[PDB]
Design a protein around this ligand. Sequence first.
Ligand code: NI
Ligand code: NI
Lengths: 39, 43, 44, 41
Amino acid sequence: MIEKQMDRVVKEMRRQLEMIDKLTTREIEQVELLKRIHD
Amino acid sequence: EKQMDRVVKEMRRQLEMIDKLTTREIEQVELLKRIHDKLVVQS
Amino acid sequence: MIEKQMDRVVKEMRRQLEMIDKLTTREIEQVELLKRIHDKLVVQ
Amino acid sequence: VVKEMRRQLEMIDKLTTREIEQVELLKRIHDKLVVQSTGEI
Ligand code: NI
Ligand code: NI
């Protein structure tokens, strides 16, 4: 009982962390792109 | 920026749930310790 | 010492112990992932 | 976009701190159980 709930919360945190990983990655690539084109 | 906060807020949210679950786990361990100690020290 | 009873308590301690090890290692991977994200974001 | 990155850096740092404290707390519970198994448990 407490064990599934806790397992379920950990699994769900890893998923939100993956979202942050991509977002930050996409933000870094967007900065790199904008740097080239801006005067 | 709006998508990040949505994910952090849900992460911070998921962190509090874990904190409460850990508290209930401690209570379980404290009781298990009480039982363990009684079996050892009673006759 | 009634070890029949004691053996149930030990079985339950080892089980809790195994569960906690799984949670800490999975949380540790997140901490590791968070550190990498921190490194990436910090390069700028 | 740059400003928001430095802002997200602090947010990630704060999440790292909260998760480490949780790891620390679970480790403390683990260390208590171990000891209680040392009597040939
Ligand atoms: Ni262990
Ligand atoms: Ni013991």
